[PDB]
Each structure stands twice: as C-alpha cells, then as structure tokens.
C-alpha cells in the first residue's frame, strides 16, 4: 500500500492497512472511539490505547487533540485501519512531552476508527 496525502502541502500522510466496512465517515463534531499505537520515526512507541484495555474515545473537529489526529481521523471509514505519519507542525510542535516526545518530532500513529455516537 502506498501513502495517501491528506493535507494540501502532502506532508500528513496515511497508509491504509485494512479498508472501513463501508463508506461512512465520521461528521464534525461525533464522539469517536478508535484503538491507536504511537511510535517515533525510529520505531520506538509512547503509547498505545491498548495499554489501558480500552478504546480511546474524543470529539472530532472540536480541536481537543492535535491538528494531525482531527484532520486525519476525518478522512477514516467506519472499521478502516490506518498507519499515519504527522509532522511536528501538526502535532505538538517545537513543545516536548516530558520523557516522551523530544521537541519538533514527528509522530507515526496506527489509528483503527471502530465506530463513533
Ligand atoms: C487533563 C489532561 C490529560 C488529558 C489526557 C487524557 C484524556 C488521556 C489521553 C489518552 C492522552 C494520553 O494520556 C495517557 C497521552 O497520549 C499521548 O501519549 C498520545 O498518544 C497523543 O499524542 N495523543 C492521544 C491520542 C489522541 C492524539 C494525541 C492528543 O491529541 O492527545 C491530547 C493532547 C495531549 C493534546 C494537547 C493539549 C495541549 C495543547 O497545547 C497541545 O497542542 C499542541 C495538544 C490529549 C488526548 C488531551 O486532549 C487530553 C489530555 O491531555 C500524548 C503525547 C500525551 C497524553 O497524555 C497527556
């Protein structure tokens, strides 16, 4: 599978690893549920939903989460699997997550959108 560019400028990206169950995409401002895992460029992972036992649950559009999980998870079909490469400018940027994520990182985000309310 090939990289799919969702931003204008190319740089947010996606690889579909599983295709959605149908064609329906979640409207601004719906009640999310996805699994995700979250690794560096290097590989290394910072955190997954799985490591909580649960699906990871947000509003989408609403800007609570960063710019490249609103604009990517937007593009996701219902039960679509996606591997997502987010620069820092649509991520946290030149901030660091204390022991987690240096400054001006990039974030890769395997994302499975399993249903939304
Ligand atoms: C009350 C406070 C805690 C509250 C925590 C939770 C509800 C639990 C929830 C599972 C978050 C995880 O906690 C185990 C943990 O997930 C990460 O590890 C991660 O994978 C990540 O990147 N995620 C989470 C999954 C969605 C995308 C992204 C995000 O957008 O996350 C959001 C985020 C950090 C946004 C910032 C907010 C500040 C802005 O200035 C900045 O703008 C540049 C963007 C999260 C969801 C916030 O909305 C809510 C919180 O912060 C972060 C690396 C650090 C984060 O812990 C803090």
Do not use: C
Request: hydrophobic share 30%.
């Amino acid at each position: 599978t090939d990289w799919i560019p969702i931003s204008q400028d190319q740089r947010l990206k996606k690889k579909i690893i599983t295709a959605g169950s149908s064609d329906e995409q979640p409207p601004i401002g719906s009640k999310v549920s996805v699994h995700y895992t979250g690794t560096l460029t290097s590989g290394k992972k910072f955190d997954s939903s799985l490591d909580r036992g649960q699906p990871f649950v947000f509003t989408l559009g609403k800007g609570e989460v960063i710019r490249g999980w609103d604009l990517g998870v937007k593009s996701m079909k219902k039960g679509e699997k996606s591997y997502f490469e987010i620069p820092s400018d649509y991520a946290y940027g030149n901030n660091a997550i204390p022991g987690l994520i240096p400054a001006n990182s990039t974030l890769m985000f395997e994302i499975e959108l399993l249903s939304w309310k």
